[PDB]
Point group: D2
Chain length 171, copies 4
């Protein structure tokens, strides 16, 4: 036979191993409109109606946003917008209340509860009113038969909605 | 009540959703030694003995390499090196053969098969011999009771070994 | 050479493939005690204090319940019970309210919100009072540094608490 | 207010938690045919040609087998059978060799290596020949663009083929 010594410069002792990694996909929507009816004297919402243009989704990656519009997700061709309609506001105190409404995603509609947190009812710089507030809640993909082809393994059944709102009085 | 118009500049309609992502962890080892006995006339390995200093692991991220040395992985304090010992080379042709040997990781030992692919038996620039060759194979973490605390879900039971070798004749 | 025909009776064309399956682990606790202070005239809880003997966990499989007591979960030796202490009840209406309290699991304590749903305030068969009600809420394993070794992949970070209560007046 | 004592008989302190569980799906095929050319004097295969009726899949659960025929898997309407064609047998010894061939699944074709293990070349009860042997190997779903909609997370990219064969001489 014959004996050899490695040449460490052009020798590689390598391995490959596959692991899973959980992560949050976080996005907003650039285009939406809403109607806000709110009584500062009693700190109660009276009407809250929101429409969100699915096309305007932004999850900081253009190739995924496009993918979102396709049949296995949003179907933005057939269903161009998602809507929220307040049916009930149940007051907890002046900072806090429980908002019930109807959400529609791709033409399927379910009633949801959002947690209203009033973050400051001011009379702004110009003598005209402002308000801050947040709406927070969790919805289940399965309740809206959303992304039904994608397993609840790969992508979570749970979607967390955070809506942060500044808003000025009308006219 | 009262009516408000959003101020889109300080309003955010956001969502968070958790998804899984598979990925390969790929690494080498910077420090190892081997003994290579090989007969160019018959293109057969005669002896292949390798020792790899666990401490020298490099998976291009220093905080994971450290973690690798801990009890839930390598136990590098107690078991500072991993070893491979050839017990058998079964020739397929002059380019190809099936190497059987004993691998020991953290003091547990199993016989493995690697796929030997001879990538070129030359007589180098100076009149003295060289050889290229690769060893490739898959081993199961469970066979070596490796990382036993980490599920076969989070991290794959399968480890793929690629060893790429250039090597010069002795003395 | 030579030609052969299969004998289908002792021939098997087989395959193995690994897949993931999500599932709910659902359990109760057989031994716990509570203190219930409740005013039927205003349908408000005044005091709700609960202690649950970790040892009495029942997830319909004895080998997992034992495992639950070990260091990588409950540490039932060191921390034999988990406790809930009401700090606040915020009334929504006569059927509904938001209970805030302190939960302690393995000596770590966080304030939680449970959704109180009063399911029927009767005066029972004997002339003495009864009440039904449920408490429902979600807590995050990570908030209580629970099962910290087990990834949020293998086991969900989210735990759903359902407490169903029938309860009779005292003495 | 008022004080209550639980009625433990109609009280339940419950929890729900979601976890993942890996498992093997194991199946065979009830209907297939093959052509077997084998030389006992040199223990070499000469020809091995197999066709497997996709329709005859059996993974011990009828509702999954049906599902297997659909577009997101087999497409059994369009592609009713899968085929294996031996292109090469490389002998290791009289018990062992490396079989290369072309596998076609749903009209996509890749060359694969199977590990031939001869388990006993007898002359049977009646004076006519028999042979046992196994073929074993791993193929990647991704190489055959199989189940492309199903992630490599939910279902493994790796498929393990075990073929166990008894076989009698012809005519």
């Amino acid at each position: 036979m014959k004996e050899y010594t490695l040449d460490k410069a052009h020798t590689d002792v390598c391995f490959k191993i596959k692991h899973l990694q959980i992560s949050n996909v976080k996005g907003n929507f650039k285009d939406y409109s809403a109607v806000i009816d709110f009584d500062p004297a009693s700190a109660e919402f009276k009407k809250l109606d929101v429409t969100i243009k699915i096309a305007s989704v932004n999850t900081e990656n253009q190739t995924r946003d496009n993918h979102l519009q396709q049949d296995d997700f949003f179907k933005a061709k057939k269903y161009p917008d998602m809507t929220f309609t307040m049916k009930k506001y149940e007051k907890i105190d002046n900072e806090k209340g429980k908002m019930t409404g109807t959400l529609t995603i791709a033409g399927v509609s379910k009633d949801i509860v959002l947690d209203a947190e009033i973050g400051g009812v001011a009379k702004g710089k110009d003598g005209k009113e402002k308000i801050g507030f947040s709406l927070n809640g969790k919805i289940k993909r399965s309740d809206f038969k959303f992304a039904t082809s994608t397993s609840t393994i790969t992508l979570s059944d749970d979607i967390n909605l955070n809506i942060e709102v500044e808003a000025n009085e009308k006219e």
